Design a protein around this nucleic acid. Structure first.
Length: 266
DNA sequence: CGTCCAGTCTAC
DNA sequence: TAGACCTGGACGG
């Protein structure tokens, strides 16, 4: 999951939890090496916001709930397979590693953080990850200025296809968005990042870093349904597609592209 | 049965 | 940098 999936996950949590009251504890699987959430409340609501490739849940006790409690914020990273699901309390999916339980009256549900591969992480404290740059979806102007003001950073010595994964500057861009972004402008993936970025000191590369992921968000989904899956595969122009070339960057990750690999190709 | 493929994080 | 962390779904034999 990339920025769009984190964003759609946060919309899922806000819409699905809008009229639910949670109660009790926050239960973690025995196999998850992530920390226990020390939170109990007889009546609380769950809300979410995304920033880049991170999501923040707020656990908000209702007036009078017991035990007394201040709101608790948790921040999640999804790694390669994370997602949120609202399931019936006795029909936990496999790999549901953190669980929030609806209070009565009404059907007993569980909001679940599901993570097949367990590369996902959560931290106590509502803080965004120090060092992550602004959200390409929700903080576009800050995102743009943070890149153009820091082209001296040795980050921009690297191929543009590698620079685009650096979450210090492109918080929310992953392996599918970098292919899709570079394909829209036919920028060779192994062009030097500083070359492509100095040259903008109709839409440019930093605009597409925002407008391309925004397109995915506008498809709908909930972190991505088995028909909204078809919508996504059809939107894709480059990542995985017949007729496209592919190489490994210096971190063994696969960049998809058409035409010139570019000057810094291995 | 087997291999290969699909975002960080951290010990050299 | 190269492993490391994980599971499962495509395939190949």
């Amino acid at each position: 999951p990339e920025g769009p999936e984190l964003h759609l996950a946060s919309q899922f949590v806000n819409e699905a939890c809008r009229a639910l009251v949670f109660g009790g504890c926050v239960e973690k699987s025995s196999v998850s090496r992530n920390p226990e959430v020390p939170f109990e409340s007889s009546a609380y609501r769950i809300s979410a916001s995304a920033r880049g490739k991170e999501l923040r849940l707020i656990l908000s006790p209702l007036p009078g709930a017991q035990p007394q409690q201040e709101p608790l914020a948790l921040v999640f990273r999804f790694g390669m397979s994370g997602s949120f699901q609202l399931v019936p309390r006795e029909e936990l999916p496999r790999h549901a590693h953190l669980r929030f339980y609806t209070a009565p009256p009404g059907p007993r549900l569980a909001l679940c953080f599901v993570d097949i591969r367990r590369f996902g992480r959560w931290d106590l404290g509502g803080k965004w990850q120090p060092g992550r740059g602004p959200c390409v979806l929700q903080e576009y102007q800050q995102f743009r200025e943070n890149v153009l003001r820091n082209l001296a950073d040795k980050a921009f010595d690297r191929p543009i296809c590698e620079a685009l994964l650096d979450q210090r500057f492109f918080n929310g861009i992953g392996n599918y968005l970098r292919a899709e972004i570079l394909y829209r402008l036919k920028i060779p993936p192994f062009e030097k990042a500083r070359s492509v970025l100095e040259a903008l000191q109709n839409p440019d590369l930093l605009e597409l870093c925002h407008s391309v992921p925004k397109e995915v968000v506008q498809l709908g989904g909930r972190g991505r349904g088995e028909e909204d899956f078809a919508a996504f595969r059809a939107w894709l122009r480059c990542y995985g597609m017949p007729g496209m070339s592919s190489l490994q960057d210096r971190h063994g990750r696969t960049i998809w592209f058409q035409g010139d690999p570019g000057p810094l190709a291995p």
